[PDB]
Amino acid sequence: MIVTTTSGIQGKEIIEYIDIVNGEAIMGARDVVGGRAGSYESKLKEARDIAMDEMKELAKQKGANAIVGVDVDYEVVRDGMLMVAVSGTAVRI
Amino acid sequence: MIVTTTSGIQGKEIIEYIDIVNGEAIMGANIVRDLFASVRDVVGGRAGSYESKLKEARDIAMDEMKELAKQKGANAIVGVDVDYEVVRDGMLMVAVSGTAVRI
Amino acid sequence: MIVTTTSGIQGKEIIEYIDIVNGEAIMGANIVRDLFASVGGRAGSYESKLKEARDIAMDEMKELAKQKGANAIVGVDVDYEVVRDGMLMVAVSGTAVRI
Amino acid sequence: MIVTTTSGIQGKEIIEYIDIVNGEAIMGAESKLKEARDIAMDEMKELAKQKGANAIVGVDVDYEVVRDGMLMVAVSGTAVRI
Amino acid sequence: MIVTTTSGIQGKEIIEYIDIVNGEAIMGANIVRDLFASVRDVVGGRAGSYESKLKEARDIAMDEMKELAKQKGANAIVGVDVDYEVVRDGMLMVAVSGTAVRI
């Protein structure tokens, strides 16, 4: 199933814009370092995937086979906690 | 009513761009532990987790946006964006914006 | 005059991109408990004041757009950020165009 | 040089997408906010021009309080040829 | 590789949408402090330096996103967004996202 940060699936007609769906993960409460320095996946991959799984599960719940126009937001939330929040429009194609 | 975070509705022409519409809601304060107060604080309101309350606040901000759009004679809202910001004393704000359109 | 968050306008040709235009406003301070100071301005809730500031920001942007001889703003975006010790700045951005 | 927040120019095909370009201005220590935004935008345009671009599309502005009293404004965009 | 903040490649149809890809970089507090140059007014990121003081963080974020995309068999990344956020004790994070595609 296609998940894209773009407005449409080039080649495919959208049958229905079903709903806007979201997912969120709250992560735990001269050196510039990459997110994958010293590890195979990025430190935020677990958070990001939890957030995207929730969004995908909801979309699937709503009869979607695709999710377009997705955005990722990051906010430091509670006592230091990182939230990753993902939003997108569930569609039938 | 069609609501999308994309810049258009494939299949339909936009007959008129009516206006830009917004909705916000701030979460309720912490009560104790992972318990958080109702976003909408009058008889009925439900306490719960940070995530269930965040989702509630995002649902009210959304519904406020849709109610304004409908007041303006819109049948669709395109180019919807969500924004999150921690404001006064740790409460989370959810703000939603989009363009109300006739299709 | 058309103002829109979409990247374009349907059915109408842009004959000229003029300039990116912006507006901003900072929310007034907290008075007491849930009451916030106007940005004969009225005190209100956080959300009421927030809406007021966003309205001022949007008007300021349109104002700048019209004076540059535009009749439309496209690709509009709203940004929020807490500023000088607890106080929500709104900032609106857009592309002023001739249609 | 046409600069726009839209993702596209009208009556003008993009023939090269050169790079994403960025500008930033740092303040503190509303009118100075405008100055900052201008410095960020001018810095991004300069880079775009030096890269061989004649337009910048999909422009976005971000605002961040890096410390306290310091506000950063960052603009990002795609440098293109039309 | 074409990297673009736009939602498509004018002139080129997208034949496959592979994955959303992300890259990030994190700046130490010690370093963020060495960009409080604003001891006077407003200064550009390129005042007194060749490349912007944040360019290295962005380039590391962008490199990781691209390396990932490339490994997934993509030859372009579209709908790119850059995000900034202050986390833990004053470190600055720059995060980038986009859709890895095949054209």
UniProtKB/Swiss-Prot annotation, chains B, E:
Top-rank taxon, per record: Bacteria
- SUPFAM superfamilies noted in UniProt: YbjQ-like (SSF117782)
- What InterPro entries does the record point to? UPF0145_dom_sf (IPR035439), UPF0145_YbjQ-like (IPR002765)
Q: Which Pfam families match?
A: YbjQ_1
Q: Name the family the entry cites.
A: Belongs to the UPF0145 family.
Please report the name of this protein according to its UniProt entry: UPF0145 protein BC_1012
Curated annotation (Swiss-Prot), chain C:
Q: Name one Pfam family in it.
A: YbjQ_1
InterPro entries listed in its UniProt record:
UPF0145_dom_sf (IPR035439), UPF0145_YbjQ-like (IPR002765)
- Name it: UPF0145 protein BC_1012
HAMAP family associated with the record: UPF0145
Q: Which organism is it from?
A: Bacillus cereus (strain ATCC 14579 / DSM 31 / CCUG 7414 / JCM 2152 / NBRC 15305 / NCIMB 9373 / NCTC 2599 / NRRL B-3711)
Give all cystine bridges in this chain.
Answer: none
User: Matching PANTHER family, A to Z?
Assistant: UPF0145 PROTEIN YBJQ
The family classification in the record reads: Belongs to the UPF0145 family.
Q: Name the domain of life.
A: Bacteria
Swiss-Prot record, chain D:
- Please give the start and end residues of each transmembrane region: none
**Superkingdom assignment:** Bacteria
- A Pfam family this chain is assigned to: YbjQ_1
Signal peptide range in chain numbering: none
By its UniProt entry, which InterPro entries does this protein fall under? UPF0145_dom_sf, UPF0145_YbjQ-like
Name the PANTHER family for this protein: UPF0145 PROTEIN YBJQ (PTHR34068:SF1)
Name of the protein in question:
UPF0145 protein BC_1012
Protein source organism: Bacillus cereus (strain ATCC 14579 / DSM 31 / CCUG 7414 / JCM 2152 / NBRC 15305 / NCIMB 9373 / NCTC 2599 / NRRL B-3711)
